[PDB]
Amino acid sequence: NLYFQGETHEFTAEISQLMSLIINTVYSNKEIFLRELISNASDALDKIRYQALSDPSQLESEPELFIRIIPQKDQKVLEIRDSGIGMTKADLVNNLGTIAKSGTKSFMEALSAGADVSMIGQFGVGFYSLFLVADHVQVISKHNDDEQYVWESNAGGKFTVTLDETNERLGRGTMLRLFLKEDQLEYLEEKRIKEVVKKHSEFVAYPIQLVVTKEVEK
Amino acid sequence: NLYFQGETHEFTAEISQLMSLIINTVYSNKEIFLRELISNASDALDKIRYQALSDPSQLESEPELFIRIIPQKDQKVLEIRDSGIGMTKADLVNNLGTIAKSGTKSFMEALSAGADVSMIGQFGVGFYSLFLVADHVQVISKHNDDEQYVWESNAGGKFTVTLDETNERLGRGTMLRLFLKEDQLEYLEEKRIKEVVKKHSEFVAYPIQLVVTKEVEK
Ligand SMILES: CCNC(=O)c1noc(-c2cc(C(C)C)c(O)cc2O)c1-c1ccc(CN2CCOCC2)cc1
Numbered sequence: 001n002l003y004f005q006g007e008t009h010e011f012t013a014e015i016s017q018l019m020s021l022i023i024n025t026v027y028s029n030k031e032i033f034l035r036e037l038i039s040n041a042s043d044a045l046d047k048i049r050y051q052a053l054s055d056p057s058q059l060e061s062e063p064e065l066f067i068r069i070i071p072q073k074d075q076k077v078l079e080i081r082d083s084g085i086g087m088t089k090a091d092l093v094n095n096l097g098t099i100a101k102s103g104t105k106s107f108m109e110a111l112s113a114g115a116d117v118s119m120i121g122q123f124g125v126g127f128y129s130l131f132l133v134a135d136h137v138q139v140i141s142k143h144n145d146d147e148q149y150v151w152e153s154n155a156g157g158k159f160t161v162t163l164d165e166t167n168e169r170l171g172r173g174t175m176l177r178l179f180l181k182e183d184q185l186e187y188l189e190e191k192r193i194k195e196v197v198k199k200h201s202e203f204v205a206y207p208i209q210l211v212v213t214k215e216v217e218k
Numbered sequence: 219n220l221y222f223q224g225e226t227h228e229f230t231a232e233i234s235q236l237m238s239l240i241i242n243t244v245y246s247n248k249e250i251f252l253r254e255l256i257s258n259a260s261d262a263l264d265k266i267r268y269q270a271l272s273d274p275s276q277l278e279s280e281p282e283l284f285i286r287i288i289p290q291k292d293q294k295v296l297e298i299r300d301s302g303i304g305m306t307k308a309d310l311v312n313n314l315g316t317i318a319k320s321g322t323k324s325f326m327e328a329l330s331a332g333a334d335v336s337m338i339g340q341f342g343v344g345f346y347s348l349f350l351v352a353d354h355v356q357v358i359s360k361h362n363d364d365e366q367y368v369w370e371s372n373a374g375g376k377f378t379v380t381l382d383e384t385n386e387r388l389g390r391g392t393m394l395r396l397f398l399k400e401d402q403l404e405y406l407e408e409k410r411i412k413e414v415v416k417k418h419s420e421f422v423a424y425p426i427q428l429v430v431t432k433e434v435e436k
Pocket residue numbers: 037040041042043044045047082084085086087088091095099123124125126127139141173174176
């Protein structure tokens with residue numbers, strides 16, 4: 001019996017470590033990670049927007065279309081949430097598999113031809129750019145036709161997409177939870193986040209909301 | 219400027235994690251790791267034996283040719299030492315790079331064609347079979363023409379081959395230090411090691427020594 005034929009998703013976490021090494025060596029300015037996450041959220045928002053055009057009940061799970069950035073300073077986590085179409089369990093497996101396969105292609109090309117700062121133009125590298133600032137990621141998603149699921153890059157053992165009985169309920173859409181590297185904590189600060197959004201995501205056609213909790217120093 | 223072209227050694231640790239996942243799924247019986255380590259030691263012993271044939275001073279750094287297995291129960295480490303030719307710093311870099319490149323080939327083939335228990339016949343898979351029982355490895359080596367060097371698969375950060383100012387002095391040769399998985403501690407036991415050596419390494423033409431420290435229970 002044969003194992004792993006075509007089963008690239010089984011290696012998603014390992015392939016991400018290869019891509020993290022490449023992309024962090026190539027890009028010293030990490031801030032483009034946020035552009036890429038917002039662009040992927042925008043695409044998922046377009047999908048629900050067009051489906052709901054002929055079937056508005058699809059919006060009732062989360063009637064507003066938005067992208068929402070929530071720094072969690074105590075946890076050193078940056079959360080990016082959208083109310084896009086979301087992913088069923090099978091969608092999440094299939095999308096991670098495609099992302100993983102594109103990573104193998106980008107990694108093999110780096111070895112054969114070398115990598116430079118144009119690599120951000122390659123399919124899938126936008127996802128891996130989250131590892132410019134994060135050492136670990138949780139991808140949480142809720143599609144109208146399925147339950148809430150989560151994939152954790154740091155989960156020990158076999159690749160798994162787990163029924164989410166732990167995180168807050170998304171009504172619909174996707175949240176990436178970025179566990180930031182100790183040298184990239186600037187991206188938990190409101191001023192820095194706003195600078196990066198205005199610089200790189202001006203033409204995104206959805207509201208980008210920033211949720212900031214701070215103790216009042218008295 | 220281009221990064222990583224041909225620099226497969228830079229990914230040795232990440233490629234090993236891919237190979238570890240494949241080989242542990244394919245092989246439920248882990249014991250062949252020892253056959254493969256002994257076979258690589260035997261090859262390095264042949265090289266010093268033939269060089270010393272015309273230049274016996276090469277043996278003076280370690281005059282006996284042997285393979286030596288040392289369980290370190292307290293550390294959950296199994297050490298395999300040989301008095302082979304050893305590797306200079308550049309040899310260790312070059313051999314890890316070749317091993318890493320063969321891993322990329324085996325991993326891509328597993329995805330395209332599937333992997334089965336014949337994969338042990340592929341170039342380089344013998345090295346990766348150490349991850350049947352170990353989660354981490356240190357490769358320590360001393361060649362007559364260089365200082366003692368070490369590579370650590372679990373060392374954080376950039377691939378590096380470090381001048382060894384920590385471990386015991388090898389006079390000449392190579393030691394792999396295997397940090398065993400919690401479910402593979404049977405391979406620290408003398409009875410088990412001896413069974414595996416007799417079964418799989420009968421035709422190795424060097425003495426295989428086993429060094430066992432035990433408290434006398436009184
Ligand atoms: C069944 C259809 N479902 C979706 O399209 C969907 N729902 O949520 C998606 C998001 C995925 C990501 C990461 C995992 C790529 C987000 O960061 C944000 C999302 O909303 C998401 C999505 C899926 C794929 C893509 C496009 N690819 C292109 C190649 O790599 C990155 C993503 C963009 C968004």
